[PDB]
């Protein structure tokens, strides 16, 4: 007995896997093109640049009642959709890769929104230079990955009650 259709949770899980590969494709590009391979190194730039992170505190909770978790998931995805747009394509060589990733992320947000609607459940940083865009690109990709790795669990849990 769940407030979410099992197919919705499955399509969501399929979108996480898809976005996880997009971001992986992006993070491969940035390390092959700009030898920017370890986000760890860019840790402080997180504050310097103002990279907003995304919580899922409402997710290690809920069950038959879960609009809170659905609202965090959406807003979290909604945020990374914004940050990726802020990177203004990073560069011509990364433009297509980053573009793929932002469409996917945007539609995943839309999709979680519209489902909440159906079920009745009802700014951006600057990155002012090549390097800042490249570094911001590496940090947002990795914050997206952590967010998604946590979401995967939240969802697997929801899909297997």
């Amino acid at each position: 007995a769940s407030s979410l259709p099992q197919s919705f949770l499955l399509k969501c899980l399929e979108q996480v896997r898809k976005i996880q590969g997009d971001g992986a494709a992006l993070q491969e590009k940035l390390c092959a093109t700009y030898k920017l391979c370890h986000p760890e190194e860019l840790v402080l730039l997180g504050h310097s640049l103002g990279i907003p992170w995304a919580p899922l505190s409402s997710c290690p909770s809920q069950a038959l009642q879960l609009a809170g978790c659905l609202s965090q998931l959406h807003s979290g995805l909604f945020l990374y959709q914004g940050l990726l747009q802020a990177l203004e394509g990073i560069s011509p060589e990364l433009g297509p890769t980053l573009d793929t990733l932002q469409l996917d992320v945007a539609d995943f947000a839309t999709t979680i929104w519209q489902q909440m609607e159906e079920l009745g459940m009802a700014a951006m940083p600057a990155f002012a230079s090549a390097f800042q865009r490249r570094a911001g690109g590496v940090l947002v990709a990795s914050h997206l990955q952590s967010f998604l790795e946590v979401s995967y669990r939240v969802l697997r849990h929801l899909a297997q009650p």
Partner: protein, 200 residues
């Protein structure tokens, strides 16, 4: 005059009468219609035995094959034939397993014995008790603002089930519907509204 090929032939397995009931669209009036079938294997490529012909009654655009004339968890090809003195038309054949095609909603009720809480219980529609079903419960405070909230993946029968958090009105409506668990089948219609007063 020549009869036009019948259309929109559909078939449903009625557990009440234990018979595959088919109906077609007779098309532009111009005759007799004979629902014809043959036992077969999947895709209805296999030309199996001839299921005795069911001839539709007078002004009835439907027939009905009694289960004595049907193999059950096997496929069969069905089609209607319109015959006039000036020719005969014939619809496209369907290929169905009768057990694949009509559920009636489950029996939802109040648990016959906390604030904003309702205890419930339900049993499946008996003639389909053999079928493993998965149901959906939807409920809502009877307010001028119609908004249904659901509960998914419930069993076809519950000993007792406490729905809670119901404080937003003195009375709530509840309905339930089921569908064959993991094999082809359509949802049953929603059970009749059930006004219930959450423990106020």
């Amino acid at each position: 005059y020549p009869p036009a090929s019948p259309s929109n032939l559909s078939c449903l397995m009625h557990l009440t009468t234990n018979s595959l009931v088919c109906q077609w669209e007779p098309g532009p009036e111009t005759t007799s219609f004979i629902l014809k079938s043959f036992r077969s294997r999947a895709d209805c490529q296999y030309q199996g035995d001839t299921i005795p012909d069911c001839v539709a009654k007078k002004r009835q655009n439907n027939c009905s094959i009694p289960r004595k004339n049907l193999l059950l968890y096997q496929y069969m090809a069905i089609w209607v034939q319109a015959e006039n003195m000036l020719g005969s038309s014939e619809s496209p054949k369907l290929c169905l397993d009768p057990m694949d095609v009509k559920l009636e909603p489950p029996m939802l009720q109040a648990l016959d014995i906390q604030p904003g809480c309702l205890w419930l219980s339900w049993k499946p529609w008996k003639p389909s008790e053999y079928m493993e079903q998965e149901c959906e419960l939807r409920y809502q405070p009877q307010l001028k603002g119609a908004n249904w909230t659901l509960v998914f993946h419930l069993p076809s029968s519950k000993d007792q089930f406490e729905l809670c958090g119901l404080h937003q009105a003195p009375v709530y409506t509840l309905q339930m519907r089921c569908i064959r668990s993991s094999l082809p089948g359509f949802w049953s219609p929603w059970s009749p509204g059930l006004q219930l007063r959450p423990t106020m």
